């Protein structure tokens, strides 16, 4: 009942308002030798694993148009929840993004940690590598939600959390790691620059979603009907 | 003659142009952790000691908009000479950055170094530090190059060369410590991003002016003529 | 039938046309001295309380985009109906701006009233202070068009009226107290100065929203299905 | 000598800056009751007939690029120093609207008190009541200003600051009584509103302007050689 | 049958662009002293009766945005008829526009015989006169194409082509009496020259909409149902 | 003397302003039928004609950029009474062009009569219609202005006013006949619609120009020294 | 099902990606003398050829929005199967041209094989140009791919890839031949050059409609129902 | 004397007007095969080798602003005669570029031969390669026209005419080889496409510049005074 959808979208709202307050507030690199990288990269973890602890017990806990768009394709969600979700973490992100502009000075909330391609990589690159990070992200966690996969895997949520900081350990050097557009998206509209921007939906839309394709057929793909299944969209 | 105003030109561009390709290659803060500050700080003292050694012995290796507008107002140079200085700084610093981007891989020779004012600054705070950097910068040379003054100052080069490393050490986290035009004209040519750079001209402008004033007739004035010696301008 | 919906989408353009045209051609501050704020205050709140003794008897008299969004959240209209609504209070708006500038002298039609947010007081206080003035306005419409309560409020409009009022003596400061997009929406058009205008849909939107929140849930609740009347979004 | 030139360009920064940042600083229409009109506009006025106690005594207290220009077509002054005290005024104006801007709290420093055409008003008329008042106000400076003229006129900077107070409590209501350009470009340069701006120069330049023509050879002409004075253009 | 829906499509695409193409190609003033405006005026009125006793024979003739429009309101056609004829009409526009283009020299094809409003008619005016010369138009149509209404009308095809004559007889001096949006569509789109273009749209169709409401309720009501009849909408 | 340089500047400038005013006044295009043509063709001569008799008993009544550009290649004026000129007719133009402005009602003063090329006119045949324009009239003056040259040619102002009037029967339905800069120049500004402009700059100056030569050194050459005359430039 | 539906759109991805990849990559005018025109003629038959013996295996091979046009107004498709496809086509070009550019040098990858109207060409020729490309190549498609007809046309791929080819043959000179929006779009995106690029929509999209118009009812006619066939719409 | 500065800047105007002209209408590629290199290589030789054997009689034939910027630094001529030439030049482009455009069909005159950066070239090679143009090219020039260079070097024309030629064989693939900014001013400002445009004047200014310092100075110096012959500027 909307008891449920209502709650799950309120969860994706606070969930990735949370994920873009603690995670880019924790990059506006207030520490340059210690690279922010170690930092920056395990506050994205935690602030996922935590968010996950927390909401991936009502809604899944996306906090992510990418992974949203990854179990869409990957049928298991309907268009409509589908796209509730990006439009509340797309909020969301905002949301929790203005916050923390109206909780850290000036000196320090620079341009908001905006994700911007590294100096020498290109956008296609970037584009590569976003893909990459969604991919090995979206992966990540379609094998820790995905039940019929058990026995000993620990706590689903470092599971996940790893997967985004390892994304992060990766790709902050190649594109400030964004893969989530959510939180490239956020800080693009409280700074007002949206350049190279394009390269944070595209490469983790793709990546998102041919990892959901490597997964459900190529990797671990599914016993029983594949048409009959997509029958969810209808509903 | 024109066998000297046309050197001292040419040193002023060759001068100008090693500064910007020394100084600003140095800039690329390839390291984060070791403050580039006290690199990138030296890098353009040092840089600027060595061009004085080696060209202030001609033109006086101004190979900055500011300090030769200081001497301009100074009365010590004529308006002419004081305009060739500038358009061969501009030229020296546009082809010591165009250079540079030619020999440092992409990855590296990112912006160029472009001053930005720091985040929280404002572009009157930034106006204001980059005004006490031309200030105590321009005072030093006055101070050095003026002969009546002697005894026992060392090296003009350190002494002044550790003036412009004050003035990073300060300004590079308030504005990036531009206290050049030449400076930060160089790569707002090349990457075509003037943002916040006339701060850069009026600042050390306003600096360099106020600077030949706090010291041609506050601190250490003349004791001749002073309405005499502004016949240099005719001539 | 449609001799209903369609009377309440005249009643809801002719409504909001005369709210526009009465409250902003009375702000149209004309008098300095003696506050226009009690005076364009009550301008506001009597237009409304008049426009809902006259029209809340058929669609309501929401006149304000954000009521309309406050009553669809409500799960008490269609999302047809609230579409229509509030394309009908746009194009009141506009039209009764388009009347009362054919009316009114230049030297006194200036901007037409136009929202602007306050000199120091920036976008997001802005928008949260258009957040707090259609949290307290949508609260009070809420709670006198509630049935259930009743007893002794006395009228809805001036119950009402007032709620609008209290909103610019207040928020006029801050943000010239749109509080109605329809209001912000109709002088940005007639005199293209869209500025600063986003505040005004986002500030009493989410208002408006967490204001049918604050109470429909939160503060007096409803004791029945929640899910179940949510059906009538299907019809 | 310079000690001269140089002396009246600064007391001409100065007297402008001071002008600027007190007139436009009583100008932040704190007080919408009681008329700012006889606030402001004696302000402007005992700010001018301070200067001209003060300056006057020195450079000749144009502290307007207009008035400036109407002593240079009177083939008073040198081209030179015309365009000195322009530059200078325009300097001093900027710069003392610099600082009101550090000083005043933003809730108060708004657009700092930028001159805006009255809403009806057009330009033409705006530019035609510009117009009057630099020639009233140029034409009373004159007549200050001219020796032969004498006997008991009693205090040229009040007999000088009553004529631009009289400016104002005329022209506030038309242009914002601009009447000085400097005064509009200062606060043009520092919030980007360059709005009907050229109405600002024009008016006043062509005021000016046929204002010492209106007197120079109109209503008090001279009494020995026109076009042998006109020789200290060439010095 | 489609054999229908797609016939009167193409009827209302070729009776729209014969209708610009004749209408527009006479209006190309090639003829100052006679007024063009007999000229164009009974152009686009014969234009209008030829392919009303053409096409309205198959289609209903409209070859007008505002005339569809004006029978949607009607409650006559489906949303679906109703935006396929002006897709075909702005279709047809542009392409009898094309046409003309290429047919007639460049010395005669100037603007295209553009709408314009007249210079010191402002858009308001202009919009108001728009308004009154689709009411009556639409106003004729919806008369002569009303089968309840008989006798002696003799041809619906002048009853009807009169009307837009008589439009421009009027409205060519005010607006240049586009009255037709496709008419003011096609030749803004082969110019690129949209200036005051939206008055041909509000106009016309605010004209259309109060034309089928003075009609259908007001002058020559309805005897049946007026909510059963809006099921035609559902189909 | 001075009493001869600023009153032929000023000649000039009212010389201009009022040409603009009558001419373009008459140009106003109130009257399709009897071709605007013959009435603005000799509004523009008898204009200039007056205005010769009138003012080219002072200056020379160019009251024509094109004109004063081709006395000076003329090596007949100063560079310096040159552009005295130009920037006196102007300011003549733009002036006369405003009052115009202020005296005619709106739906008459359209774009004040802007020369726009004619519509398959392209700009280089443009251009070079007003080649043809200036140049037969440039060497219509030159011929009327030339001392040697007398015996019976009764009017200059006629002998001068028809070569205009020539001009425009011929060049207004080309170019609207500009062919004075001036001309083009003050409605191009009020407007504010600079659209194919340079080609009245370009398209009269070249005619001009190539006129003052057809005819100094071409037809009727000069029998002194022509290398000893152009000393006039120098004064 | 599906496991078709989604892999058309595949196969639709994939041989469109091939097409642009081939074709375009063929296409880079690396050879002057040998007309490119024989050679990218070829590659662009050929690569369709080879795409259709392939794909048209499974989808039909489209690979070009002006082709699943043609399908759909055909009456042969869905609106959503038609729309799959654009999207794919589109988005297979878009890769298919991405990879290129990462696989040949710069020197080589200009702008990507961009299509262009040839310079004298003017749009609407152009325009014109893209009509009967599209046209002859939608009418052969439509004929090789109906099975009603047969007997011996040997292969549909060539009998179609011969089709494309002539379709350059001429094309290429006129407007480099897109026939095909996803081949122009592809590279308008890559470039960021959208200049005259809507000629290539319009263009092909009229060719391909009023190809399978030609086709379908005039020329090889339906011999059962029509209006019934037009039920796949509702699927 | 004059009849000779004002012949030499015609024959400069004419000289450069026909190189243009010739040069630029042998360029329009018409020939794709049998490379347009040797034929508007030699085309852009013989055109110079003609216009100097025709006007280097009288002006010198530079023909291109970086000639004569190459005589200016080398003290030959004057700053006056090298900016009537430069202007002479300019004026001589476009007027033999829009001669060219009125003779030739649209078919033909594309971008008239519009100079553009190879594809996979970038500016900084782009400047590179055109200084090494315009140095092997004023290299050749300066040796020819050195009078005391002499014995048998045949003619300076072909001595000359090759050198350009050479200057294209080699650099028409890297920019068009423009190395006469004239020659890419002209058809820049026909077709209004100056893209990567600076290249062409800095590039030759540069290479001409240091091109008669490699030869004034460095290879070939001079006898007699430097700083005494400097005096040539003065007059
Ligand atoms: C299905 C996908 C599976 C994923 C696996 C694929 C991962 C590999 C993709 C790598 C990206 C390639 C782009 C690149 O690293 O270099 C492109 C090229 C660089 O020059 P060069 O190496 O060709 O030769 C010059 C050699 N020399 C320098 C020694 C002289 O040109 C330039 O402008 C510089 C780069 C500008 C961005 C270009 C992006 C191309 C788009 C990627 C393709 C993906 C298709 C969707
Ligand atoms: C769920 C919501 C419940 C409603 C209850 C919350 C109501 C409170 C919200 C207050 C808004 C905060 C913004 C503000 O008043 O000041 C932001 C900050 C000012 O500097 P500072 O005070 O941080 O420190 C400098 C201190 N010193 C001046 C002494 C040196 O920066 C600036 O640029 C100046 C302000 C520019 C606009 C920034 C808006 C932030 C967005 C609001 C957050 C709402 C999330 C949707
Ligand atoms: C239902 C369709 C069936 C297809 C069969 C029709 C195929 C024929 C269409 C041909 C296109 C006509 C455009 C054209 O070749 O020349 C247009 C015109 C050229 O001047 P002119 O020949 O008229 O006279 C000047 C004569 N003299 C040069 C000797 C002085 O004007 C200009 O600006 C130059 C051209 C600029 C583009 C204009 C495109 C017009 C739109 C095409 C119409 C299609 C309707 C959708």
């Keep these: 009942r909307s008891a449920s959808f209502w709650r799950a979208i309120f969860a994706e709202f606070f969930a990735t ?19 922010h990288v170690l930092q920056v990269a395990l506050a994205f973890g935690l602030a996922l694993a935590t968010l996950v602890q927390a909401v991936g017990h009502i809604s899944g806990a996306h906090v992510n148009p990418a992974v949203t768009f990854a179990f869409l394709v990957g049928s298991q969600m309907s268009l409509l929840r589908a796209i509730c979700y990006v439009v509340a973490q797309l909020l969301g992100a905002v949301a929790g993004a203005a ?41 990540c966690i379609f ?14 949520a470092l599971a996940v959390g790893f997967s985004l900081t390892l994304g992060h350990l990766f790709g ?9 557009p959510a939180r490239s998206f956020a800080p693009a509209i409280l700074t007002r620059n949206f350049t190279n921007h394009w390269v944070y939906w595209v490469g983790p839309v793709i990546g998102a979603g041919l990892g959901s394709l490597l997964y459900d057929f190529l990797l671990f793909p599914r016993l029983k009907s594949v048409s009959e299944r997509l029958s969810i969209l209808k509903g």
């Design 17 to 35: 308002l949370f994920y873009v307050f603690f995670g880019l507030g924790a990059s506006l690199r207030w520490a340059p030798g210690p690279l």
């Design 99 to 139: 916050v923390l502009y109206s909780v850290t000075p000036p000196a320090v909330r620079g341009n908001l940690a905006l994700n911007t391609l590294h100096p020498g990589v290109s956008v296609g690159q970037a584009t590569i590598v976003e893909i990459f990070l969604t991919l090995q992200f979206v992966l």
């Design 143 to 156: 094998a820790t939600y995905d039940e019929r996969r058990n026995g000993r895997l620990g706590s689903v």
């Design 172 to 180: 902050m050097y190649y594109t400030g790691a964004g893969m989530n």
